[PDB]
Structure 1
Amino acid sequence: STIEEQAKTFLDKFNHEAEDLFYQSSLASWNYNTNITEENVQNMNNAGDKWSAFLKEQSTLAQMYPLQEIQNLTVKLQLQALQQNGSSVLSEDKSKRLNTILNTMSTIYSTGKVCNPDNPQECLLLEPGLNEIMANSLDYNERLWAWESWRSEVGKQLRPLYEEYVVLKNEMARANHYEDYGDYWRGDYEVNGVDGYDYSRGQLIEDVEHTFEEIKPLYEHLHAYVRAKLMNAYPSYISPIGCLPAHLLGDMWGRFWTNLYSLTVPFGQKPNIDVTDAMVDQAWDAQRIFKEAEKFFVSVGLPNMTQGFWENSMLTDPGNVQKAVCHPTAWDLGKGDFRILMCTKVTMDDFLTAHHEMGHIQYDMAYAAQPFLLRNGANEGFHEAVGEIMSLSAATPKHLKSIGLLSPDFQEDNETEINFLLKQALTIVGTLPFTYMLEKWRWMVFKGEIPKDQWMKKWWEMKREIVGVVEPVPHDETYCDPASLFHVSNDYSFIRYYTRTLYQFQFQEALCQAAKHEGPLHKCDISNSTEAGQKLFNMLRLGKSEPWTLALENVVGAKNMNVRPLLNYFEPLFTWLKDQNKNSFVGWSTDWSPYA
């Protein structure tokens, strides 16, 4: 009869066939990941082509239902999600060129192998050949050689490809009634039609700047402390007044600072909280790791794992004969099939990763009642944030004492909390200016604020201004230094990490206030609290049915992303860093004072 009922019937013949095709494709991808064989690659490609062709045919059929004659908000949300053209609005020649460009960037990044000139008989790939050198070497010119040679090869291959990529993506985005591709990426957070809870694409950049302006003093103090410690490690290269040299940050790009924890530890004399030896002494299998994680999730009141989870997951490396991807990934295959693919070792990192991926699994299980096209996070930040809050809670010494992995007579003084908070700041706070600077640079590239001949002069200017990191030697426009990273070279949004980081501590304050924890925020554990799990599950059950602003109202009582919980989390460390930076100089100079 009416258009709305027609759309509802169309959405049911979508949902019911879609769930089954997405299942077939996801199972083919799983069989490829647990069994790397060429026929499994072909089966994966066939299933993916069927899935993409089915999405093309349903997008072609969904647009024939006009949006303004539908009043139900959920139906309008699913129809808005389905009616996006994507790349289909672009011509077939340009679509084929764009797909070819994306594939060849994937091959250049994946198969990029670089070694020293005049010694070409063997070479090292990025993982793990260059990662170990960047994370463990203490030699200035070796790290400088590796950094400059990898940005020389990768940037000089990828610069014309990225110049074609920006033009094609801008053409597709303006063909889709967006201002640029940056507006297309910012449209994930766009909420329209809800009174009070509306969020605009232009409000995202303003909110990101507003939060980062409050991030900036903590990062300035942390940067001053890291500068002083790296001056101790490398005596003459680092200046007291200038920025940090780029190749000394412990990783390839500066994404994380967590490999500088050995050099920048406050109290080396005090012990660590390493629990690896304790699990080795008690012979903890990976099955016991996942059962303890399941015990954590049943303690907070969330549902426990299905029988099919324990039957169908691969929690151990299969062997020499069978090859599998080692990266930990949680799979929501559809139809109540939930699996974790992790090559779990007996380490603290794998235990925390098990908590993180089982948090992903819990988030996927919670919105299983929703319709298929609404089975996602409310935004891209929540899905990672609900795993990172489990990573926060599991890392606490109270959780380790509760499960028996730590001695009950372990002395928790202030020095161990300071160095633990510094490790968490090097992991968490240090990625924030890099993430914000990268997304702002990509937004200015897509918007056309930066011409192609001026990409790098602005980029290093941004890095000195925001990240406080100086280039070792100047780079001309033959280099493509951003696209050496995985996410930018393979067409991925990057603001999800910034939003994840802020949502992580907002959720942490909300659940710790729910759990009536009476101490510091970093000493808080959300186990044994049914009400904290209920407050979590109220947002978890919604999925993508409700706006992310309304979900954030459901958890923390605020209509917008907030920066104050992060600053409250690092407040002991903030006072300690302000005490330690009395003699030294907080802040940096954008001039070439250390080295150029």
Structure 2
Amino acid sequence: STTEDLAKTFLEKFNSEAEELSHQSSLASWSYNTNITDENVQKMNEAGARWSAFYEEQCKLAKTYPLEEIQNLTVKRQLQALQQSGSSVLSADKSKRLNEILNTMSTIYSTGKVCNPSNPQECLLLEPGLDAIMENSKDYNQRLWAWEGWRSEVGKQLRPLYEEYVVLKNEMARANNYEDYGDYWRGDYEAEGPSGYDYSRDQLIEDVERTFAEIKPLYEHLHAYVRAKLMDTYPSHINPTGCLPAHLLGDMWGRFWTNLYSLTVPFGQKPNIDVTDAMVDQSWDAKRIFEEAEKFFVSVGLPNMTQGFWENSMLTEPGDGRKVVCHPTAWDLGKGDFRIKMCTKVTMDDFLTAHHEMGHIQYDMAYAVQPYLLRNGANEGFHEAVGEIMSLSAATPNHLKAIGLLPPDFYEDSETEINFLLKQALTIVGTLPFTYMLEKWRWMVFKGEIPKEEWMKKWWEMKREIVGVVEPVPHDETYCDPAALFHVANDYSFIRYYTRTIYQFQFQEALCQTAKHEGPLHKCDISNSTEAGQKLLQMLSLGKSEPWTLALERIVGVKNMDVRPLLNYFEPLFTWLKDQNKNSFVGWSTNWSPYAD
């Protein structure tokens, strides 16, 4: 028959075996992640070996069905995802060692302990423990001990492993005709579909860098303001024209500045826009947090969570002897099995995260209608952005008041508006440079621009120049500080958190216009607009079936990242910030460090 008819039947074969093998792999991964055991590590590795072996043989077979001779775009797109394999192209010994490296790096990170010098018996994991210090402590020494002790105990172990990791990951990328493993990662944004909807891997770097130029003035001012207000909390440790010490940024990495909110709130006598204390005082639990997020999605027309979700998910650390990996994640295990793994605390951050993860599920639930090869996000940024459209609404004073976390006599003035905008900025603007600078470093390592001998030299040079953050302790090439972040040790690409943040507001601007909202888009609560949920679900249900440039142009007007909605959303905080910084220095000197003092 036609080469199109042969490939349709080939795909139907593929879909039925893959559904089985990827389900067994997902199940085996879930039990490891929910119950870290030697037996479950072996079971995980085996099920993934069967999935990888399958997947690579099907890639080779897919090539015999040449793309040019098929005329149905859906099949043509299903075959394209099958054309480029993964680590199979490596020597069996070679892919043996790389799978070992990834398993060691992941369990070094989740088993690492750093011990108190003053108390050698008290040994702390990252989660919970070191993280509790890095979020709630106000002592320069306590945070420094945790920050440095983390990068020194597990960072130092990961360094020899990370070196082998780039050489092998790059050997796998070049064997697949990519320049390097970074080029391979940027492939996720590659779009060859229709005309005018084309996007190449190399444009992602130009576009990321052009848009980061427009964000930088707002960030410099946010930076100047929090640097001023940390001098009230850390007098004799902050230089008013310098970079900010990296252990004082509110988490283990300064990934989000949200826990600086207490130290930086402008109008603190107003009703607290951080509803963490109101949640505790009303005896909320993790269940309530997830039920409230479910209530939100139902009010916009999206479905409720499945019954299996409530039975199978891990919504708090179990504390029954099992060791868990606590990093919040939303799983589509296949066969309609949707779960969330999260060690949920009673916190506005985890309240917002639970919305973030539920949006992942909601996306996975909608593109279930698509054929197997096509049930993924349009790109990775889309996927991390659906959750954050919900957080944008769920965090508004308005929505908080309707949920009961703000008093019924609560009223919005210009001071609670700056409060809310400043907290949003600590989370969403504070993370852009941190995210940009990390993947720039990663991309440059894989490319060859940074040699092993300068890995930590360039990391702390880029931290200071781009992020305005400085290391509290000198770090030799014996260190490997970026690998102390979960996503790096666990072989995940990071630029999704950058493109997501720009996508966030493009989506939010478009759904609010559908919700017939009037006024600024930071006042907008998408809650109860079924028209808005209808518009969103139309893109969610498309999955990867259309190129992401078209998928974007179908919700919002444009076919590429636009930073204009993000800047409008923060236009009142930005004008306010400029005034608070009218007699202050905006920017940073890279020369000063806490230890050259």
Aligned-residue offset at 1:420 = 1.8
Q: Deviations over 1:374-404 (max 9, x none)?
A: 1110001111111111111112222233344
Once the two structures are overlaid, the 10-residue window that deviates more, 280-289 or 85-94, is: 280-289
For 1:307 and 1:562, locate their aligned partners in 2 and report how far apart those are by CA, in whole Å.
38
Aligned equivalent of 2:96: 96
Aligned equivalent of 2:64: 64
Judge conservation of contact 1:538–1:554 (CA < 8 Å) in 2: no
Describe the shift of the 1:378–1:315 C-alpha distance in structure 2 as closer, same or farther (beyond 3 A). same
Aligned equivalent of 1:396: 396
For 2:143 and 2:463, locate their aligned partners in 1 and report how far apart those are by CA, in whole Å.
19
Provide the secondary structure at the position in 2 that maps to 1:50.
helix
Aligned equivalent of 1:335: 335
Aligned-residue offset at 1:291 = 4.3
Aligned equivalent of 1:107: 107
Structure 1 residue identity aligned to 2:566:
L
Judge conservation of contact 1:241–1:593 (CA < 8 Å) in 2: no
Judge conservation of contact 1:515–1:526 (CA < 8 Å) in 2: yes
Describe the shift of the 1:279–1:494 C-alpha distance in structure 2 as closer, same or farther (beyond 3 A). closer
Once the two structures are overlaid, the 10-residue window that deviates more, 213-222 or 124-133, is: 124-133
Once the two structures are overlaid, the 10-residue window that deviates more, 472-481 or 77-86, is: 472-481
Describe the shift of the 1:317–1:582 C-alpha distance in structure 2 as closer, same or farther (beyond 3 A). closer
For 1:383 and 1:198, locate their aligned partners in 2 and report how far apart those are by CA, in whole Å.
20
Judge conservation of contact 2:106–2:490 (CA < 8 Å) in 1: yes
Judge conservation of contact 1:173–1:181 (CA < 8 Å) in 2: yes
For 1:309 and 1:125, locate their aligned partners in 2 and report how far apart those are by CA, in whole Å.
29
Once the two structures are overlaid, the 10-residue window that deviates more, 151-160 or 27-36, is: 27-36
Judge conservation of contact 2:143–2:247 (CA < 8 Å) in 1: yes
For 2:407 and 2:114, locate their aligned partners in 1 and report how far apart those are by CA, in whole Å.
46
Aligned-residue offset at 1:339 = 3.2
What is the number of equivalent residue pairs in this alignment?
596
For 1:340 and 1:481, locate their aligned partners in 2 and report how far apart those are by CA, in whole Å.
29
- RMSD of aligned residue pairs (Cα, Å): 2.5
For 1:155 and 1:43, locate their aligned partners in 2 and report how far apart those are by CA, in whole Å.
28
2:586 maps to 1:579: no
Describe the shift of the 1:6–1:399 C-alpha distance in structure 2 as closer, same or farther (beyond 3 A). same
Aligned equivalent of 1:173: 173
For 2:480 and 2:29, locate their aligned partners in 1 and report how far apart those are by CA, in whole Å.
32
Describe the shift of the 1:20–1:132 C-alpha distance in structure 2 as closer, same or farther (beyond 3 A). same
Q: Deviations over 1:313-337 (max 9, x none)?
A: 4556666377766554433232233
For 1:95 and 1:317, locate their aligned partners in 2 and report how far apart those are by CA, in whole Å.
33
For 1:130 and 1:487, locate their aligned partners in 2 and report how far apart those are by CA, in whole Å.
17
2:562 maps to 1:562: yes
Percentage of identical aligned residues:
87
2:216 maps to 1:216: yes
Map 1:331-480 → 2, pairs under 5 A: 331-342=331-342, 347-480=347-480
Aligned equivalent of 1:131: 131
Structure 2 residue identity aligned to 1:112:
G
Aligned equivalent of 2:140: 140
Structure 2 residue identity aligned to 1:573:
L
Aligned-residue offset at 1:348 = 3.8
Judge conservation of contact 2:286–2:346 (CA < 8 Å) in 1: yes
Describe the shift of the 1:277–1:425 C-alpha distance in structure 2 as closer, same or farther (beyond 3 A). closer
Aligned-residue offset at 1:121 = 3.5
Once the two structures are overlaid, the 10-residue window that deviates more, 316-325 or 356-365, is: 316-325
Once the two structures are overlaid, the 10-residue window that deviates more, 279-288 or 7-16, is: 279-288
Structure 1 residue identity aligned to 2:382:
F
For 1:424 and 1:121, locate their aligned partners in 2 and report how far apart those are by CA, in whole Å.
39
Describe the shift of the 1:220–1:111 C-alpha distance in structure 2 as closer, same or farther (beyond 3 A). same
Judge conservation of contact 1:245–1:595 (CA < 8 Å) in 2: no
Describe the shift of the 1:125–1:325 C-alpha distance in structure 2 as closer, same or farther (beyond 3 A). closer
Aligned equivalent of 1:162: 162
Unpaired segments ≥5 residues, structure 1: none
Judge conservation of contact 2:193–2:547 (CA < 8 Å) in 1: no
Q: Deviations over 1:408-456 (max 9, x none)?
A: 3212122122122111111111111011011111111111122222223
Aligned equivalent of 2:532: 532
For 1:322 and 1:462, locate their aligned partners in 2 and report how far apart those are by CA, in whole Å.
39
Structure 2 residue identity aligned to 1:428:
I
Aligned equivalent of 2:293: 293
Describe the shift of the 1:136–1:348 C-alpha distance in structure 2 as closer, same or farther (beyond 3 A). closer
Judge conservation of contact 2:471–2:594 (CA < 8 Å) in 1: no
For 1:345 and 1:241, locate their aligned partners in 2 and report how far apart those are by CA, in whole Å.
37
2:498 maps to 1:498: yes
Aligned equivalent of 1:588: 588
Judge conservation of contact 1:228–1:240 (CA < 8 Å) in 2: yes
2:149 maps to 1:149: yes
Judge conservation of contact 2:134–2:143 (CA < 8 Å) in 1: yes
For 1:200 and 1:348, locate their aligned partners in 2 and report how far apart those are by CA, in whole Å.
39
Describe the shift of the 1:37–1:195 C-alpha distance in structure 2 as closer, same or farther (beyond 3 A). same
Aligned-residue offset at 1:353 = 3.4
Q: Deviations over 1:549-579 (max 9, x none)?
A: 1111011110111111111111111111111
For 1:15 and 1:187, locate their aligned partners in 2 and report how far apart those are by CA, in whole Å.
23
Once the two structures are overlaid, the 10-residue window that deviates more, 323-332 or 90-99, is: 323-332
Q: Deviations over 1:514-560 (max 9, x none)?
A: 11211221110112222211211121110000011111101111011
Aligned-residue offset at 1:350 = 4.2
Provide the secondary structure at the position in 2 that maps to 1:333.
strand
Q: Deviations over 1:448-475 (max 9, x none)?
A: 1222222233222211211011223433
For 1:531 and 1:296, locate their aligned partners in 2 and report how far apart those are by CA, in whole Å.
14
For 2:279 and 2:124, locate their aligned partners in 1 and report how far apart those are by CA, in whole Å.
34
Provide the secondary structure at the position in 1 that maps to 2:26.
helix
Structure 2 residue identity aligned to 1:407:
P
Structure 2 residue identity aligned to 1:179:
E
Aligned equivalent of 2:188: 188
Provide the secondary structure at the position in 2 that maps to 1:128.
coil
Aligned equivalent of 1:552: 552
Judge conservation of contact 2:471–2:593 (CA < 8 Å) in 1: no
Aligned-residue offset at 1:282 = 6.5
Provide the secondary structure at the position in 2 that maps to 1:542.
coil
Judge conservation of contact 2:472–2:593 (CA < 8 Å) in 1: no
